[PDB]
Design an enzyme around this catalytic site. Structure first.
Site, PDB file in Angstrom:
ATOM      1  N   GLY A 157       0.819  -1.545  -0.148  1.00 47.07           N
ATOM      2  CA  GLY A 157      -0.174  -0.023  -0.180  1.00 47.07           C
ATOM      3  C   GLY A 157       0.823   1.487  -0.412  1.00 47.07           C
ATOM      4  O   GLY A 157       1.777   1.262  -0.045  1.00 47.07           O
ATOM      5  N   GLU A 172       7.627  -5.641  11.070  1.00 45.18           N
ATOM      6  CA  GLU A 172       7.201  -7.387  11.747  1.00 45.18           C
ATOM      7  C   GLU A 172       6.119  -7.512  10.547  1.00 45.18           C
ATOM      8  O   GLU A 172       5.215  -6.359  10.685  1.00 45.18           O
ATOM      9  CB  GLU A 172       6.723  -7.850  13.165  1.00 45.18           C
ATOM     10  CG  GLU A 172       6.573  -9.353  12.915  1.00 45.18           C
ATOM     11  CD  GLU A 172       5.895 -10.137  14.395  1.00 45.18           C
ATOM     12  OE1 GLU A 172       5.541  -9.009  15.043  1.00 45.18           O
ATOM     13  OE2 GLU A 172       6.101 -11.040  14.165  1.00 45.18           O
ATOM     14  N   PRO A 196       0.260  -8.906   8.409  1.00 44.15           N
ATOM     15  CA  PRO A 196      -1.091  -9.302   8.154  1.00 44.15           C
ATOM     16  C   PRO A 196      -2.161  -8.909   9.237  1.00 44.15           C
ATOM     17  O   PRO A 196      -2.458  -9.341   9.860  1.00 44.15           O
ATOM     18  CB  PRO A 196      -0.954  -9.955   6.315  1.00 44.15           C
ATOM     19  CG  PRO A 196      -0.673 -11.085   7.408  1.00 44.15           C
ATOM     20  CD  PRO A 196       1.037 -10.376   8.264  1.00 44.15           C
ATOM     21  N   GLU A 207      -7.144  -3.145  10.464  1.00 43.76           N
ATOM     22  CA  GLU A 207      -7.466  -2.058  11.852  1.00 43.76           C
ATOM     23  C   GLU A 207      -8.721  -2.696  12.036  1.00 43.76           C
ATOM     24  O   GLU A 207      -9.585  -3.049  11.967  1.00 43.76           O
ATOM     25  CB  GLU A 207      -7.259  -1.013  11.321  1.00 43.76           C
ATOM     26  CG  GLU A 207      -8.665   0.178  11.548  1.00 43.76           C
ATOM     27  CD  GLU A 207      -9.409   0.131  10.055  1.00 43.76           C
ATOM     28  OE1 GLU A 207      -8.461  -0.601   9.258  1.00 43.76           O
ATOM     29  OE2 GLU A 207      -9.141   1.614  10.223  1.00 43.76           O
ATOM     30  N   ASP A 220      -2.957   7.405  22.433  1.00 44.59           N
ATOM     31  CA  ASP A 220      -3.834   7.773  21.748  1.00 44.59           C
ATOM     32  C   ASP A 220      -4.350   6.179  20.982  1.00 44.59           C
ATOM     33  O   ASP A 220      -4.601   5.761  19.982  1.00 44.59           O
ATOM     34  CB  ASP A 220      -2.707   7.882  20.111  1.00 44.59           C
ATOM     35  CG  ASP A 220      -3.133   8.291  19.160  1.00 44.59           C
ATOM     36  OD1 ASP A 220      -4.192   9.206  18.893  1.00 44.59           O
ATOM     37  OD2 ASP A 220      -2.578   8.474  17.751  1.00 44.59           O
ATOM     38  N   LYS A 253      -7.191   4.268  19.937  1.00 51.67           N
ATOM     39  CA  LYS A 253      -8.663   4.172  19.133  1.00 51.67           C
ATOM     40  C   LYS A 253      -8.320   3.030  18.468  1.00 51.67           C
ATOM     41  O   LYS A 253      -7.294   2.557  18.394  1.00 51.67           O
ATOM     42  CB  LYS A 253      -8.715   5.766  18.107  1.00 51.67           C
ATOM     43  CG  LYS A 253      -7.759   5.923  17.661  1.00 51.67           C
ATOM     44  CD  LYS A 253      -7.633   7.278  16.770  1.00 51.67           C
ATOM     45  CE  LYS A 253      -6.440   7.136  15.450  1.00 51.67           C
ATOM     46  NZ  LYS A 253      -6.219   8.805  15.062  1.00 51.67           N
ATOM     47  N   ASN A 294      -5.801   3.011  15.557  1.00 45.28           N
ATOM     48  CA  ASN A 294      -4.553   2.334  16.181  1.00 45.28           C
ATOM     49  C   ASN A 294      -4.211   1.077  16.843  1.00 45.28           C
ATOM     50  O   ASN A 294      -3.461   0.827  16.672  1.00 45.28           O
ATOM     51  CB  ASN A 294      -4.047   3.519  17.185  1.00 45.28           C
ATOM     52  CG  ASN A 294      -3.847   4.553  16.709  1.00 45.28           C
ATOM     53  OD1 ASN A 294      -4.336   4.492  15.246  1.00 45.28           O
ATOM     54  ND2 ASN A 294      -2.920   5.623  17.115  1.00 45.28           N
ATOM     55  N   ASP A 306       1.396   2.940  15.872  1.00 46.38           N
ATOM     56  CA  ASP A 306       1.466   4.845  16.003  1.00 46.38           C
ATOM     57  C   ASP A 306       1.778   4.448  17.542  1.00 46.38           C
ATOM     58  O   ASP A 306       0.568   5.026  17.947  1.00 46.38           O
ATOM     59  CB  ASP A 306       0.059   4.534  15.799  1.00 46.38           C
ATOM     60  CG  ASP A 306       0.503   6.582  15.610  1.00 46.38           C
ATOM     61  OD1 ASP A 306      -0.733   7.351  14.181  1.00 46.38           O
ATOM     62  OD2 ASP A 306       0.950   7.066  16.385  1.00 46.38           O
ATOM     63  N   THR A 350      -7.920  11.779  19.668  1.00 44.41           N
ATOM     64  CA  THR A 350      -9.179  11.891  19.152  1.00 44.41           C
ATOM     65  C   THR A 350     -10.727  12.219  20.298  1.00 44.41           C
ATOM     66  O   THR A 350     -10.790  11.400  21.149  1.00 44.41           O
ATOM     67  CB  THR A 350      -9.261  11.020  18.379  1.00 44.41           C
ATOM     68  OG1 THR A 350      -8.635  10.417  17.686  1.00 44.41           O
ATOM     69  CG2 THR A 350     -10.786  10.787  17.545  1.00 44.41           C
TER      70      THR A 350
END
EC number: 2.7.11.11
Length: 325
Positions: A37, A108, A111, A114, A153, A155, A158, A171, A188
């Site tokens: 990506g 690492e 796959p 999220e 952070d 959420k 993440n 993150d 957030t």
């Protein structure tokens, strides 16, 4: 012995935190397999270390773009943190290096996708499914807090769900090594603790509040404090008043009242016994903490999941800005 695990983990951490490893690989050591990506600063590629055979996900960050987007501090911080930590539910930075054009974070290969999009598709997680994930976040925060890190952070975006159905926290851009209190507004709105919003200064307990929010969202399919305008979100958070879906178990309601606790002298994870108030809570009675940590529990859910040159300039770009990388 948890005490002694954590003490050794802190010694390993401080060593790496004070003297960060730099340029622990180079690009010619990696065989480029596939672009997975394209992120904000550059591509993520599946690669193989040609000297060992191990496969990795190499993130490429164009230095000039990081500067342009004003992400120098976040990028440097994340890297410094990631090379210094080691826990089963934290994304593992295996190598890093830089050249004239790019920074490289060789992670690492994990796959899976999220949690935000998984939650949107599934609707909501059953309580056992939510508890399984929450247990991993509990152990990860126990670990990070022991090192004086505030994650700040938490959420669903993440949280990666890996190929084994386990959580990987990603993150660490906002994370801060803090002994005592700190003041920066970040993160957030939905997930922010009252003391952040009211600019009171705050500590590691903001992570425990955010966990409260996460568990509610996982189990409800939506977060406890929501509105169209962030000020209405802030208003709800500061009130304390939480309404629960009718299907929430009595045990879940109780845990969440203790995590979503505005009063810091009552908030689970902020008291004399710290994380153990949470680990000993009735909602977690069936949780085998050791089996979770050892990745021996079968996950409730296993996710399903033209090449271009990496052009390296003959001139070093943004060298001084990324000296520490």
């Amino acid at each position: 012995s948890v005490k002694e695990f954590l003490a050794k983990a802190k010694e390993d951490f401080l060593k790496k935190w004070e003297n960060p490893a730099q340029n622990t690989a180079h690009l010619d050591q990696f065989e480029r397999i596939k672009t997975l990506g394209t992120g904000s600063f550059g591509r993520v590629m599946l690669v193989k270390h040609m000297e060992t055979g191990n496969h990795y996900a190499m993130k490429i960050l164009d230095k000039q773009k990081v500067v342009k987007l004003k992400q120098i501090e976040h990028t440097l911080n994340e890297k410094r943190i990631l090379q210094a930590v080691n826990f089963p539910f934290l994304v593992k930075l295996e190598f890093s290096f830089k050249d004239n054009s790019n920074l490289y974070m060789v992670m690492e290969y994990v796959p899976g996708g999220e949690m935000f999009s998984h939650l949107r598709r599934i609707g909501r997680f059953s309580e056992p499914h939510a508890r399984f994930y929450a247990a991993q976040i509990v152990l990860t925060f126990e670990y990070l807090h022991s090192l004086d890190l505030i994650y700040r952070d938490l959420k669903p975006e993440n949280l990666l769900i890996d190929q084994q159905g386990y959580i990987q926290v990603t993150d660490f851009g906002f994370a801060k090594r803090v002994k005592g209190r700190t003041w920066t507004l970040c993160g957030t709105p939905e997930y922010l603790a009252p003391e952040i919003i009211l600019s009171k200064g705050y500590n590691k307990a903001v992570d425990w509040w955010a966990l409260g929010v996460l568990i509610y969202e996982m189990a409800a399919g939506y977060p406890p404090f929501f509105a169209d305008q962030p000020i209405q979100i802030y208003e709800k958070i500061v009130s304390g008043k939480v309404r629960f879906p009718s299907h929430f178990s009595s045990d879940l309601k109780d845990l969440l009242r203790n995590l979503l606790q505005v009063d810091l002298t009552k908030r689970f994870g902020n008291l004399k016994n710290g994380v153990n108030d949470i680990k000993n809570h009735k909602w977690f009675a069936t949780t085998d903490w050791i089996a979770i940590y050892q990745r021996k529990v079968e996950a409730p859910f296993i996710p399903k999941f033209e090449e271009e040159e990496i052009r390296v300039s003959i001139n070093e770009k943004c060298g001084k800005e990324f000296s520490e990388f």
